[PDB]
């Protein structure tokens, strides 16, 4: 990812403040609520039929934490996104067959959650850096499709 040093420092600094559990649980839940076809991949989680059911599902919260954690690894490894996500790429591509457009959807949902949580501190400038990060992550995960 093509980020300046200033950009990288601002990105890392925000991550120090990210509660992976809260943010993660909310990001995955919002994906499931906003883009309903994504529910097809999480049948094993039980009831995902309504907003309430989704947002309060413990498997969703647990799984979202996992997602955010791997995200955090990316944030910390901006120089080798492809290397960091190769195993996840194989999983999502070969085993799950998730269309890569969905990677982009999750990244954008994550960005909206960060905005919701950080308010005025999530500046247009910081958001711009995060769009670069999410794009980088989506690309590294789409890898084994290419």
């Amino acid at each position: 990812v093509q980020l300046s040093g200033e950009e990288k420092a601002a990105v890392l600094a925000l991550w120090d403040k990210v509660n992976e559990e809260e943010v993660g649980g909310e990001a995955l839940g919002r994906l499931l609520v906003v883009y309903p076809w994504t529910q097809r991949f999480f049948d094993s989680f039980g009831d995902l039929s309504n907003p309430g059911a989704v947002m309060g599902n413990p498997k969703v919260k647990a799984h979202g934490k996992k997602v955010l954690h791997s995200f955090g690894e990316g944030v910390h490894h901006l120089d080798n996104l492809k290397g960091t996500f190769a195993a996840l790429s194989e999983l999502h591509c070969d085993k799950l067959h998730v269309d890569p457009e969905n990677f982009r959807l999750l990244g954008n949902v994550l960005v909206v959650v960060l905005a919701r949580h950080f308010g005025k501190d999530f500046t247009p400038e910081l958001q711009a850096s995060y769009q670069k990060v999410v794009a980088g992550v989506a690309n590294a995960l789409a890898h084994k499709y290419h």
């Binding site: 839940g29 919002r30 609520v33 906003v34 907003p51 989704v54 947002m55 954008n108 960005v111 909206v112 959650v113 905005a115 919701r116 949580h117 308010g119 005025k120 999530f122 247009p124 400038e125 958001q127 711009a128 769009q131």
Partner: protein, 141 residues
Amino acid sequence: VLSAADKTNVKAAWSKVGGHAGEYGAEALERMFLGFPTTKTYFPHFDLSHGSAQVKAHGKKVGDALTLAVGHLDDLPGALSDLSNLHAHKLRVDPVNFKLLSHCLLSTLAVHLPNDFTPAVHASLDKFLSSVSTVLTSKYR
């Protein structure tokens, strides 16, 4: 255009936006130019720096159009007719750009109305923004 439930959520959420539609429209544009630089190409005649008066003025027009739309949820095509011409026929805006501004608008609302921006309202607003986007690019379809 949307479901009745959606119509309710949108009207309710916009009531909370109230008189900040303008301010929000301006911030959404700023987040779009910074975040998605390709979009700047449609505004050569614009001073794109932060606090630009044009962006501020333009944000107001965007906020007003969204406000109009919310008022005419049952007839977006008719209400936004003139804008569909400009965007699709005159400006030839690439449809992908509507998705980017939509995203930047949701980001803005999240920043300012964190307690009002619930998952159910987020979903309804996404549907609304997609509906508006379809009308603005319908001179394509």
